[PDB]
Design a binder for these strands. Structure first.
Lengths: 272, 74, 79, 852, 77, 86
RNA sequence: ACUCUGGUUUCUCUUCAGAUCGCAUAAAUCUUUCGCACUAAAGAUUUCCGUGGAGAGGAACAACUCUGAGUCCAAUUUUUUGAGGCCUUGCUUUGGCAAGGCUA
C-alpha cells in the first residue's frame, strides 16, 4: 500500500546529500522575516504591499486622503517626521502603525538564531571546535584533596565504553537542521503531484539581480500561494466512496497491467 | 549510602546530649563519625545529685544516643 | 574535625587510664588502659577494673575485652 | 470545595495543606532574557506535575502563554504565575509560587511586578548565547530588588548538537558564563555571600527542549542510584571545577594528573550527555538499544520509532526523571517566606520593619493582621471583570471577607484613597486552569476577585476595623522609564466612552502603562518600546474596547534641560503683592542627577547623612549642602531645591512658614516644565531670596504655590534651555559576517555603535549601540530586513541627551512632511510638542515673568 | 525508599510531633527528617514523661530512640 | 512471591498493639520492609481497647492525624475494618 | 528466565471526521463589491482531486521474535534482644492492671 516510509538515519543522510542541491540549506526560519504566509496575509488584508511579496485588490474599500479634513488627531502640522514608515514597518507591527487594522494576522517574533556549524569535511571529528565558532577565553573554591572523598572501584562514567564521536554522529547531528522531509525519519508516502519540488525556492526572497520578468514571475507565484492559503477551507466529511473501486466492482470492467506508454496510446485512441 | 549524622551544623558548638542510663552531658562537638561516634571536647557530665563533673573530650557511641540539643545558635 | 574513632585510637596509643560507661547501666563502669581496639567496638583493656558508683567498690580483672555494645560512653581519666 | 481540576501527581487537599504551612512555599520568578527557555521550562514542570498535559511533537506545549498575543506573536507578553507542588532531590515535596515573567526588554514591567510578589529570582541564561542585554538588566534589577538569585543554564542542547563544541570547550563556555554572571552580580551586590557557582549549589544545568534539567547534587544522586553507597553531597562537592579525577588513587586531585585528565565536570557530566545525545541523534538505529541498556532506560518499540527530537526528549526524561535538582537548588538558595519576610518588609513594605505592624508582618504569622499586597491585576476571560493578584504578607484572606483595599496613594494622614470592599471567590495561582480555595494562608499567592474596583496599579488589602496604624506598600519602581507616547482616538467619536473605559482597563492591566488626557484632548498613552505598544493596541482594540481606534504616529517624550546659568535674578511676586520670591536656576553637577535618580542620594535620610553625601561625593560646600529643601518633581527627581536665602535678610522661621508651599510649587513646576510642558531634568533651582508677609491669610496658602511655579518657570527659561531626547541602548546580536550591515543600518538613524564584540563560543557577534528613541521607530524592522532576517535587536532607555539645536530659536523654519535637519531638531521638537499638546505656540523668556 | 522515610522527608516545613521511647515528645517544625530517623527541629517544645515542658532553639533526636511521630495527614491526600 | 498480606490490610482501618502497650486504631495507609506503618486518622489508646465496653469504650484516646509507627517497637497488629471513601 | 488473549500483509463495504482531514490545491453556482471581470476581491454553496478514524467481511502466510499480560541482609540507626526479677499506692475481673522508686 506504500503508506509508511521510515528509513534509517544513514539512509536519510545519503538522501539529503544526494538532494542538497534542490534544498535551500536554511537553519532558522527567521531569515524569512516579514515574508511568511502570515506576513503576506497581513499585507493583503491591510491593502499594503511587501516589496518582495505580491499585492491584491483591497479587501475593504479605502476612502481617499481628502475624505478627512485636517482632524485634530490627523493634522500634518503636528506629526514630527524622522523616517517614513514603510509598508514593511506597518506589516510588521500592524496594531501600532495602521489605523483600523481589521483582520490583520500578526507575525511571530524572531525565533532564536540557529547557530549550527554545518560540517564541511568528513575527516574532522564530530564534536570539534570549528574555526567559525568564536574562541572561548580561558580566563572556583574547590575543596582540597586532604579529605576522604574516595569513590568505589566500581564507580565509572555511564558511557565510558561508548565513544564521544561516531561515523554517523556528525551526519546525524546535521539532519537536525534540514528541510522538513529530511528532518523527519518516518513519514507517509504522499502523492507525486502533492510534493512541489520548487515551492521553497519561490517562498524564499527572490535571487539578487534577477530580471524584471523573473521578479514579476516570483511575485505572481507568491500571489497564487497566498490566494490558495487564505482560502484554505478545511475539507468536508465525505462518506469515503471510491469511484475507481466502484467501477472495479462493476461487472463491465476488467483489470490488467500495462506500460504507461501503451496505456497512454490506448487512451489517446479512445479519446479520438 | 552510609551517610553520617547531622553533625555539620552542631559541630564546634556548645550543646547538650542525652546518653543511655539517664546520662546528661554538655560540650562542644569536635566531630562525628558514620556509626554515631561523636567527639565531645570539654565535656561535662551532670550527675543526678546536681553536681557536674568535667571529663574533657570523650567519644559517644550512636547506640545510646537519646537526643542532642544545641545550646547555641545554629 | 576530630572524630571519635581517631580519638579512641589516640587514647589507645597513648596508654592512658580511661573510663568507659556501661550502655543502659550507669551504676557501674570500667576503667583501665586499652592497648588496642577492634572494628566492632571491642577493645583490649590492660589492667581493667570494674568500678561501681553505687557501692564505691572496684574489682580488677586484668586484660579484658570490652564489647562495643556494652560500652555506651567513654571519657578520659587521670589515673 | 466541590471544584474541578486537572489530574495531578499531588493532591489538591495536599496542596492546600502544604500552602497552610508557612516555611515551605517557594516564591520564585523565572527571570530570563528573550527566548531563553523560561516558558518551556515551566511547561516541563507542568508536564511533570500534570500527567494529562503533554507536549506535542512539533509545537511545544506553551502552558504558560495564556494570552492570544503571546500565543501567536511568539514572545511572552505577561507573567502567568503558577503555584504547583513538586518534589525535591531528597524526596520532600514543596510547593512553588512560580511566576514565568517575559524576557522582552520592552516588557520589563511584568518582571518588576513579579519580584515584589516573590522572595527569590531564578535567572535564566541560554548556554549558546550566554548573557544578553535582558539577562544583565534582570540581574541588575533583581539584585537591586534585594532578593535571592539562582542562575541556571538552559539550551545546553544547542552546545551539544548545534554548536558541537568539545566537552572541555563546553565546560570553558559554562565557566565563562558563570564568571560573567558573578562579575555582573558583584558590580551591584552588597554582601559578599551573594555568590553563584555549581560548587555553591546555586546553579542548575537544564535543557527545556528535552527536559535535561540537573545539577551537581542531582546528577551525583543519579550516579548513586546507578552505583550505590556514594556520598552524593560530598562527591558533588568535588564534581565541578578545575580539579581532575585520578582513577589510580580513586580520588579527585586538585593538581591535574596523567596530563590528559579533563575536568571533573566534563569527565562525569558532559561526557555522558554527549555520548547519549550523539547516540540518540546520530546513531539511533545502530547503537540505540545497547546504550539504553547501559543507561538502564527501556523504551518500547513504539517509543523508539519516534522522530529524533521527541525520542531524545523521551530518553532524557527517562534518564533524569523529575526536575529534582532545580527544586533542591531553589530550596537551598531561595529562602522560605518566613525566612525572607524581614527583607521584604524592610525593602518594599512601608512604615518600617521595626514598627509594631512591621514586626507583625515580619513574623509572617497567618494568625495575624491581614496586610496582603497585590502587584498585578489580571483580567477575566470575558474581559469585563478584573482579578487582582498578590501574595499575603500576613493574615489569611478568605472568600466573602470584608476588606479595606488601600490604594496606591492611601497614605496614613489622608486615608481618602481607601475603599472598603468585600473580597470573595478567590482561586489558587494555576497557569491554564485556576483552582478555587476558601482561604489563603500568609505566604501563598492569592488571586482575589472583587477588590479590583479601586486597584488601579498596585494595592495592599488590609483588615477593616483594626490595624488603624497601617501604611501602603511602596509603589513599584520599574527598571527602565517609559518614553514613547502615542495619541489614540476612536474612528467614530460616538463610541468614545467605550474606548476610554477600555483604556482604563488596559491601564490597570499593564503596570508601567501611563495614560492621560492633555489640554489638547488627545488620549496619550505611554509605553516602553514598540512591540509593547503594538500589544497594548492589539488588546485595546480587540479585547477590552471592541471598537476601532485610530493611533497617531509614535513619538518620544522629550524632557527639558538647562545648559547655562541663570541669565538674571527673577523677582516673582504672589497675588496681592504680599510675597515676593526670587529663584536663581543653575544646572546640576554632572553625575548628581543620575545619583539622585538611582536613589543613591536619598533625601529620606537625615540631615547628617545627606549633608555628608553631598559635601563629599558632589564636592558641594559644607554650608551650601546644609540648606536643601526638596527633590524637584518627584521623590527621586533630577532637580534640587536649595534654600539659598541669606539669613541677614530672610527669617528662617518665616521662610519655613512658606517652605512647604515653595517645595510644592517647585515640584509642580519641575513636573510641568516651562518649554514644552515636559519634565525638567538636570537642574538645581536655588531660591536666591524671598519676601514673606506675616499673616497666613496674606502670605502663603493659595498664593505662594502659583508664584512658586511662575518663578520656577521663569528661572528655567531665563537660563539658556535645551530640549532632551531619550537614547535607547540597542544590543544587536548578529553573525560576525553581518556586523558591517548592522553598523550601516544604525548609521541612518543618528546613532553610534558603542561597542562591537563576538560572543565567546558563538559565531554571532553582539554589536551594542545607542540610537536616539525619536528616530528609532521601526529600527528593528530595518535591522532585520537589511540583514535578510539574520539579526535581532532590543532597546532600553539608557539615558537622555540634549537635542542638537536650540529650542528657543525663532529663525528656523519647519516643514509638514520633510524631516528637519540635524541642527534644526530642538526648535522643531519644541514647536511640534507645543502644537500637539495644544499649548501656546510661543514661549518667550518674558512669558511668565513678573514685569510683562 | 520507604513510605515512612518518605513521609518524614516530605513532612519538613510543617509542624509535627515526635514521641520517643522514654516519653519525650518534641513538637515543632521538622527542619531535618533524615532517612535514618534523625529528627532535627528548631524551637521545638519538648515535654518529658514527668510533665515538665521546655523549649529548645535547636534539638536533634536520633533514630535509635524513636517511638512514634504524628504529622499532618493533609499532604498524604 | 506474592506479598499481598501487607496489601490486604493496606488502606483499611486496623488496630495495632505495639510493644509499649498502646493500641493505635487508624487507616493503615503506609507500610515498609522495616515494619514502619502509617496511620491516617489514627487514634492511640493506652488504657484498654474498646470492644463492646459496657462502662466505657474510649479511655485515654488521643487523635494524632498522620501517625508514623516505627517498626522497632512493633509487637502485633489487628484488622478492624475497611477504609472510608474519602 | 514460567506461560498468555495478542501475527502482519492485502482486497471490499459501511459509518464518522473543521485535524494543516492534504506541510497539496483545483472547478462550478449564487451573493455582495467597484465594472462599462482570465486578466478581481469578499461571503457562501456544491462536485471532484485522496486521505485519516473505527467497524465488518474476505485470503495470503507468522505463530509467539516482539511486547502487553497470567509470574544475596546475626555485632549501633528498625527484623536474630539491656533480655528477666524487688518494693509501694488505687482497684482487686485476687489473673494482674496503671504509675512511681531499685538490682541488672
Amino acid at each position: 500500500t506504500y503508506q509508511r516510509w521510515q528509513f534509517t538515519l544513514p539512509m536519510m543522510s545519503t538522501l539529503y546529500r544526494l538532494a542538497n542541491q534542490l534544498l535551500t540549506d536554511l537553519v532558522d526560519d527567521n531569515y524569512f522575516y516579514l515574508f511568511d504566509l502570515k506576513a503576506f496575509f497581513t499585507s493583503k488584508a491591510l491593502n499594503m504591499a511587501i516589496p518582495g511579496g505580491p499585492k491584491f485588490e483591497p479587501l475593504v474599500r479605502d476612502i481617499n486622503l481628502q475624505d478627512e479634513d485636517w482632524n485634530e488627531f490627523n493634522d500634518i502640522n503636528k506629526i514630527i517626521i524622522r523616517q517614513p514608515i514603510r509598508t514593511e514597518y506597518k506589516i510588521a507591527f500592524p496594531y501600532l502603525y495602521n489605523n483600523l487594522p481589521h483582520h490583520v494576522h500578526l507575525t511571530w517574533y524572531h525565533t532564536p538564531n540557529v547557530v549550527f556549524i554545518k560540517t564541511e569535511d568528513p575527516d574532522l571529528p564530530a564534536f570539534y571546535f570549528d574555526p567559525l565558532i568564536n574562541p572561548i577565553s580561558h580566563r572556583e573554591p574547590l575543596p582540597d584533596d586532604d579529605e576522604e572523598f574516595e569513590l568505589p572501584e566500581f564507580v565509572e562514567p555511564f558511557l565510558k565504553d561508548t565513544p564521544l564521536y561516531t561515523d554517523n554522529t556528525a551526519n546525524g547531528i546535521a539532519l537536525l537542521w534540514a528541510p522538513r522531509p529530511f528532518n523527519l525519519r518516518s513519514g507517509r508516502t504522499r502523492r507525486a503531484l502533492d510534493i512541489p519540488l520548487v515551492k521553497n525556492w519561490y517562498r524564499e526572497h527572490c535571487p539578487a539581480g534577477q530580471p524584471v520578468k523573473v521578479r514579476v514571475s516570483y511575485q505572481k507565484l507568491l500571489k497564487y500561494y497566498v490566494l490558495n492559503a487564505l482560502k484554505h477551507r478545511p475539507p468536508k466529511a465525505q462518506k469515503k466512496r471510491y469511484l475507481f473501486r466502484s467501477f472495479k466492482a462493476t461487472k463491465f470492467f476488467q483489470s490488467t497491467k500495462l506500460d504507461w506508454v501503451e496505456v497512454g496510446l490506448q487512451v489517446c485512441r479512445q479519446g479520438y | 549510602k552510609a551517610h553520617p549524622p547531622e553533625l555539620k551544623k552542631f559541630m564546634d558548638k556548645k550543646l547538650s546530649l542525652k546518653l543511655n542510663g539517664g546520662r546528661h552531658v554538655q560540650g562542644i562537638l569536635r566531630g562525628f563519625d558514620p556509626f554515631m561516634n561523636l567527639v565531645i571536647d570539654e565535656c561535662v557530665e551532670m550527675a543526678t545529685s546536681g553536681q557536674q563533673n568535667n571529663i574533657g573530650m570523650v567519644v559517644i557511641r550512636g547506640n545510646s544516643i537519646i537526643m542532642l540539643e544545641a545550646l547555641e545558635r545554629v | 574535625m576530630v572524630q571519635p574513632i581517631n580519638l579512641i585510637f589516640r587514647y589507645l596509643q597513648n596508654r592512658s587510664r580511661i573510663q568507659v560507661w556501661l550502655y543502659e547501666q550507669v551504676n557501674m563502669r570500667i576503667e583501665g588502659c586499652i592497648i588496642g581496639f577492634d572494628e566492632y567496638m571491642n577493645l583490649v583493656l590492660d589492667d581493667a577494673e570494674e568500678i561501681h558508683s553505687k557501692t564505691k567498690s572496684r574489682k580488677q580483672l586484668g586484660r579484658i575485652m570490652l564489647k562495643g555494645d556494652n560500652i555506651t560512653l567513654l571519657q578520659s581519666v587521670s589515673n | 470545595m466541590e471544584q474541578t481540576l486537572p489530574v495531578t501527581v499531588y493532591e489538591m487537599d495536599f496542596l492546600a495543606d502544604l500552602m497552610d504551612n508557612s516555611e515551605l512555599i517557594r516564591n520564585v520568578t523565572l527571570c530570563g532574557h528573550l527566548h531563553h527557555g523560561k516558558t518551556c521550562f515551566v511547561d516541563c514542570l507542568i508536564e511533570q506535575t500534570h500527567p494529562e498535559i503533554r507536549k506535542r511533537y512539533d509545537q511545544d506545549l506553551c502552558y504558560t502563554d495564556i494570552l492570544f498575543t503571546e500565543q501567536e506573536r511568539g514572545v511572552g507578553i505577561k507573567s502567568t504565575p503558577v503555584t504547583v507542588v513538586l518534589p525535591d532531590t531528597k524526596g520532600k515535596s514543596y510547593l512553588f509560587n512560580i511566576m514565568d515573567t517575559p524576557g522582552h526588554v520592552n516588557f520589563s514591567d511584568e518582571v518588576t511586578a513579579g519580584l515584589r510578589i516573590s522572595d527569590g529570582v531564578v535567572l535564566f541564561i541560554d548556554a549558546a548565547e550566554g548573557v544578553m542585554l535582558n539577562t544583565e538588566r534582570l540581574i541588575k534589577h533583581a539584585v537591586q530588588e534585594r532578593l535571592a538569585v539562582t542562575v541556571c543554564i538552559n539550551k545546553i542542547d544547542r552546545l551539544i548538537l548545534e554548536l558541537k563544541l568539545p566537552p572541555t570547550d563546553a565546560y570553558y563556555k559554562l565557566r565563562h558564563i558563570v564568571d560573567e554572571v558573578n562579575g555582573l552580580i558583584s558590580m551591584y551586590s552588597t554582601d559578599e555571600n551573594l555568590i553563584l557557582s555549581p560548587l555553591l549549589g546555586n546553579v542548575c544545568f537544564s535543557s527545556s527542549q528535552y527536559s535535561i534539567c540537573f545539577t551537581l547534587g542531582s546528577f551525583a544522586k543519579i550516579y548513586a542510584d546507578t552505583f550505590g553507597d556514594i556520598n552524593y553531597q560530598e562527591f558533588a562537592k568535588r564534581l565541578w571545577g578545575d580539579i581532575y579525577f585520578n582513577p589510580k588513587t580513586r580520588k579527585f586531585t586538585k593538581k591535574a594528573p596523567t596530563s590528559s585528565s579533563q575536568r571533573s565536570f566534563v569527565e562525569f557530566i558532559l561526557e555522558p550527555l554527549y555520548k547519549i545525545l550523539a547516540q540518540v541523534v546520530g546513531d539511533v538505529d545502530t547503537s540505540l538499544p545497547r546504550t539504553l541498556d547501559e543507561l538502564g532506560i527501556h523504551l518500547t518499540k513504539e517509543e523508539l520509532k519516534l522522530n529524533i527530537r521527541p525520542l531524545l526528549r523521551l530518553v532524557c526524561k527517562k534518564f533524569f526523571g523529575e526536575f529534582t535538582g532545580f527544586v533542591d537548588m531553589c530550596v537551598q538558595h531561595i529562602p522560605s517566606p518566613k525566612v525572607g519576610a524581614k527583607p521584604k518588609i524592610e525593602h518594599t513594605y512601608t512604615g518600617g520593619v521595626d514598627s509594631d505592624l512591621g514586626e507583625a508582618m515580619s513574623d509572617c504569622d497567618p494568625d495575624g493582621p491581614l496586610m496582603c499586597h497585590t502587584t498585578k491585576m489580571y483580567s477575566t476571560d470575558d474581559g469585563v471583570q478584573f482579578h487582582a493578584f498578590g501574595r499575603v504578607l500576613s493574615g489569611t484572606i478568605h472568600a466573602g471577607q470584608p476588606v479595606k483595599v488601600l490604594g496606591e496613594n492611601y497614605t496614613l494622614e489622608d486615608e481618602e484613597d481607601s475603599q472598603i470592599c468585600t473580597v470573595g471567590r478567590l482561586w489558587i495561582s494555576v497557569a491554564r486552569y485556576h483552582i478555587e480555595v476558601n482561604r489563603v494562608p500568609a505566604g501563598n499567592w492569592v488571586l482575589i476577585e472583587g477588590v479590583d474596583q479601586p486597584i488601579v496599579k498596585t494595592a495592599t488589602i488590609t483588615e477593616p476595623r483594626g490595624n488603624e496604624e497601617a501604611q501602603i506598600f511602596r509603589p513599584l519602581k520599574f527598571n527602565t522609564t517609559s518614553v514613547i507616547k502615542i495619541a489614540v482616538e476612536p474612528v467614530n467619536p460616538s463610541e468614545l466612552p467605550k474606548m476610554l473605559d477600555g483604556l482604563r482597563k488596559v491601564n490597570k492591566s499593564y503596570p508601567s502603562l501611563t495614560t492621560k488626557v492633555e489640554e489638547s484632548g488627545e488620549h496619550v498613552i505611554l509605553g516602553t518600546g514598540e512591540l509593547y505598544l503594538d500589544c497594548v493596541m492589539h488588546d485595546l482594540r480587540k479585547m477590552y474596547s471592541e471598537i476601532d481606534i485610530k493611533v497617531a504616529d509614535p513619538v518620544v517624550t522629550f524632557c527639558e534641560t538647562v545648559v547655562e546659568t541663570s541669565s538674571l535674578k527673577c523677582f516673582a511676586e504672589t497675588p496681592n503683592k504680599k510675597n515676593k520670591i526670587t529663584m536663581i536656576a543653575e544646572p546640576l553637577e554632572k553625575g548628581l542627577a543620575e545619583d539622585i535618580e538611582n536613589e543613591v542620594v536619598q533625601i529620606t535620610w537625615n540631615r547628617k547623612k545627606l549633608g555628608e553625601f553631598f559635601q563629599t561625593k558632589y564636592d558641594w560646600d559644607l554650608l551650601a549642602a546644609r540648606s536643601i529643601w526638596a527633590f524637584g518633581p518627584d521623590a527621586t527627581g533630577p532637580n534640587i531645591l536649595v534654600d539659598d536665602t541669606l539669613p541677614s535678610e530672610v527669617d528662617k522661621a518665616l521662610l519655613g512658614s512658606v517652605k512647604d508651599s515653595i517645595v510644592q510649587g517647585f515640584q509642580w513646576g519641575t513636573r510641568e516644565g516651562p518649554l514644552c510642558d515636559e519634565l525638567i531634568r538636570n537642574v538645581k533651582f536655588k531660591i536666591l531670596d524671598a519676601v514673606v508677609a506675616q499673616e497666613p491669610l496674606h502670605r502663603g496658602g493659595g498664593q505662594i504655590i502659583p508664584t512658586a511655579r511662575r518663578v520656577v518657570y521663569s528661572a528655567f527659561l531665563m537660563a539658556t534651555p535645551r530640549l532632551m531626547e531619550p537614547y535607547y541602548f540597542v544590543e544587536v546580536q548578529a553573525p560576525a559576517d553581518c556586523v558591517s550591515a548592522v553598523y550601516t543600518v544604525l548609521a541612518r538613524r543618528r546613532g553610534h555603535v558603542t561597542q562591537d564584540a563576538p560572543i565567546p563560543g558563538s559565531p554571532l557577534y553582539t554589536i551594542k549601540a545607542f540610537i536616539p528613541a525619536i528616530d528609532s521607530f521601526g529600527f528593528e524592522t530595518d535591522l532585520r530586513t537589511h540583514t535578510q532576517g539574520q539579526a535581532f535587536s532590543l532597546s532600553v532607555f539608557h539615558h537622555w541627551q540634549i537635542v542638537p539645536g536650540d529650542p528657543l530659536d525663532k529663525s528656523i523654519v519647519i516643514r509638514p512632511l520633510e524631516p528637519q535637519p540635524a541642527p534644526h531638531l530642538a526648535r522643531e521638537f519644541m514647536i511640534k510638542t507645543r502644537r500637539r499638546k495644544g499649548l501656546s505656540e510661543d514661549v518667550s523668556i518674558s512669558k511668565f515673568f513678573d514685569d510683562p | 525508599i520507604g513510605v515512612p522515610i518518605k513521609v518524614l522527608h516530605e513532612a519538613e516545613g510543617h509542624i509535627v510531633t515526635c514521641e520517643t521511647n522514654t516519653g519525650e515528645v518534641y513538637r515543632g517544625k521538622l527542619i531535618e527528617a533524615e532517612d535514618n530517623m534523625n529528627c532535627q527541629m528548631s524551637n521545638i517544645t519538648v515535654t518529658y514523661r514527668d510533665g515538665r515542658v521546655a523549649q529548645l532553639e535547636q534539638v536533634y533526636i536520633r533514630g535509635s530512640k524513636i517511638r512514634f511521630l504524628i504529622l499532618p495527614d493533609m499532604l498524604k491526600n | 512471591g506474592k506479598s499481598s498480606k501487607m496489601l490486604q490490610h493496606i488502606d483499611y482501618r486496623m488496630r495495632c498493639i505495639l510493644q509499649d502497650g498502646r493500641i493505635f486504631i487508624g487507616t493503615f495507609k503506609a507500610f515498609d520492609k522495616h515494619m514502619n506503618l502509617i496511620l491516617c486518622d489514627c487514634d492511640e489508646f493506652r488504657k484498654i481497647k474498646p470492644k463492646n465496653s459496657k462502662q466505657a469504650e474510649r479511655e485515654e484516646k488521643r487523635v494524632l492525624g498522620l501517625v508514623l509507627l516505627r517498626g522497632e517497637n512493633l509487637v502485633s497488629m489487628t484488622v478492624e475494618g475497611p477504609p472510608p471513601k474519602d
